[PDB]
Amino acid sequence: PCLTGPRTCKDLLDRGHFLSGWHTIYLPDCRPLTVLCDMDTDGGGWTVFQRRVDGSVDFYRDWATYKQGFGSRLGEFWLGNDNIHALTAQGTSELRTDLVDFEDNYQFAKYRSFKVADEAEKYNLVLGAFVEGSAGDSLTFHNNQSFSTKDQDNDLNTGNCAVMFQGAWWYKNCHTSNLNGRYLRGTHGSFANGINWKSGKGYNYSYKVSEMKVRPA
Amino acid sequence: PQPCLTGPRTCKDLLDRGHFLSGWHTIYLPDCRPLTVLCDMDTDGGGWTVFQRRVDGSVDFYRDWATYKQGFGSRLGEFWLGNDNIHALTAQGTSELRTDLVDFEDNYQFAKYRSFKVADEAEKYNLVLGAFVEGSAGDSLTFHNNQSFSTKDQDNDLNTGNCAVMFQGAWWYNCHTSNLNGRYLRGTHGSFANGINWKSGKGYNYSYKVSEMKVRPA
Amino acid sequence: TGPRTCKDLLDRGHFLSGWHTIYLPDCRPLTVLCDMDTDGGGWTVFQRRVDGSVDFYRDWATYKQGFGSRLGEFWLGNDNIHALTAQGTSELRTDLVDFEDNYQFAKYRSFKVADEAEKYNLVLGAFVEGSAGDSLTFHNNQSFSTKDQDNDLNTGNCAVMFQGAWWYKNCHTSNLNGRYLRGTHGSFANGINWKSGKGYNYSYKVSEMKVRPA
């Protein structure tokens, strides 16, 4: 069934699967991977590689853990950097970020392309242009930057951005978005260690919900 | 079409076969065609297929005709199974309708019904209800029977204007007795009869927290 | 030619916790909840409390077949738990989460339950460690009781008195299938309680029981 089956969430939408949920697709190397398809938002057909919903899961994790993915299909998760690379290595995927505060305000941001290099290249980010979005652009800042974890500092800071802002990211010096930060529940006094999108609700507010998803453009 | 003799026909068959846990399973409509449904194995004995569910306001139920046509939402949250599917699922033979409704105070309420069917789209997804049977809810969905289902981008109601808009939902609409796909307006709300409203559950000013609409061959 | 435990699944590259299907000693397929995230991962979860939305005060027929929702709380079923732990020694972990979001846990060298004929009798290994303390050893070598089938060592009915289902003795020091009484409660020992953890008056927010081949 490598040849019979679907390759992206967009294919699945095309075959009449209209409910968001966990489906299995086939990577370019025929590796089956079970992913979360968002069939409801902005046309549908999105593959979701990051989800924060309740802070039930700990996102302050080491390199090996971000490499392979972690969390629960039942809630919060990170698909894993190898998988994310695999899903974007060949061709041309757009990127949607979806955010929701505790007041119930939906914000979003969209990007013309999104790709991450392989581990040899430290999961480098190549971000396309900012298209539109109510959350403002807080990711172009992090273009062309390696991913870093607490136990592997690849940022452009003389210190450790992952430790300073309690997360994992394509930190530069340090950040303008921090979606793998701590689930601090709305306003917080600690400086920028939450689920923060600057242009969105700033350095001191942590969203209720965060989702990053890709669709083939 | 006619009852698939070759695999699990309904959530009921699943139960009889030893899937005791509530969850997304897959069945074969009389088409003998597959679809992946939510089976409620736990309630009023078990065996139910759920075509509608609200829980947490996460999803926007104020959608147009084409989107109710095919179903929307998420397997992990609120969802509508789509009217084509719902047709195909009930309008083969006899199948009961149960409704579960929970208030934000954390109680429980219901409303078994004899028989439930939606005619197709060709025929405006007209609802064929049957006799109320029992349930702490009252709303004996007598009205709405023989009524075309209505959205925002179409009309068809007992009221000149959009029943849809004026109340912000979708249902088989002079104007509405029970407004289940309405706006997840957490609790008692000043605005009138636009919330997630049973009628004799909590009137028009209490939108519930949790809602489910399911079916089992009667 | 396929997995027989959550541990196997971990070994093949399934890194996300979730519902997978495994194959039991007889090859009956069984869909279980794999915890791939906690303490090394590879745990099969047979009991889960999360929010109190499921009735746990249930009979023998229901505790035998299992009940609830993969979407939330559930009990895998006594038949299943025995099949899962029929032979090659699985260790048990017990994971507990209070209402201020604090974690306590407990871990046991081994865990096994007999079949229905021996009335799902508890066979438990040695306490190896855990912030929750030991509150299960006390129940070693006791049959399981529900409300409609009293097998305890009490002249009365422990299942009824503490609104639960357990290897009740006279009666319990843990009562994890107890009523979901959110937080501290005046009522005595009828919550999701763990005597050594938070005592007979604190009922937890999350509770999970899980097995992995030792």
Ligand SMILES: *[C@@H]1O[C@H](CO[C@@H]2O[C@@H](C)[C@@H](O)[C@@H](O)[C@@H]2O)[C@@H](O[C@@H]2O[C@H](CO)[C@@H](O[C@@H]3O[C@H](CO[C@H]4O[C@H](CO)[C@@H](O)[C@H](O)[C@@H]4O)[C@@H](O)[C@H](O)[C@@H]3O)[C@H](O)[C@H]2NC(C)=O)[C@H](O)[C@H]1NC(C)=O
């Ligand atoms: C992405 O960013 C890199 C540098 O950032 C690193 O690499 C990326 C992939 C991430 O993993 C980050 O975390 C890392 O921080 C840019 O590299 C620079 O590109 C510019 C072009 O604008 C180069 O500027 C030129 O360099 C010429 C000579 O380069 C050679 O010598 C230098 C040092 O002497 C050496 O570092 C380099 O490798 C070559 O050997 C020079 O003649 C020319 O006139 C101009 O100065 C700059 O040298 C590059 N630096 C590095 C570190 O290589 C990428 O350009 C950028 N890519 C994209 C797509 O934008």
Ligand SMILES: CC(=O)N[C@@H]1[C@@H](O)[C@@H](O)[C@@H](CO)O[C@@H]1O
């Ligand atoms: C959190 C993180 O990335 N650290 C993990 C920890 O969670 C646990 O999985 C451990 C097992 O020894 O391996 C790491 O140390």
Ligand SMILES: CC(=O)N[C@@H]1[C@@H](O)[C@@H](O)[C@@H](CO)O[C@@H]1O
């Ligand atoms: C709730 C419980 O455990 N009790 C059940 C009850 O709900 C019902 O299903 C009955 C048979 O009709 O079996 C028990 O007696």
Ligand SMILES: [Ca+2]
């Ligand atoms: Ca650094």
Ligand SMILES: [Ca+2]
């Ligand atoms: Ca009209």
Ligand SMILES: [Ca+2]
């Ligand atoms: Ca007794």
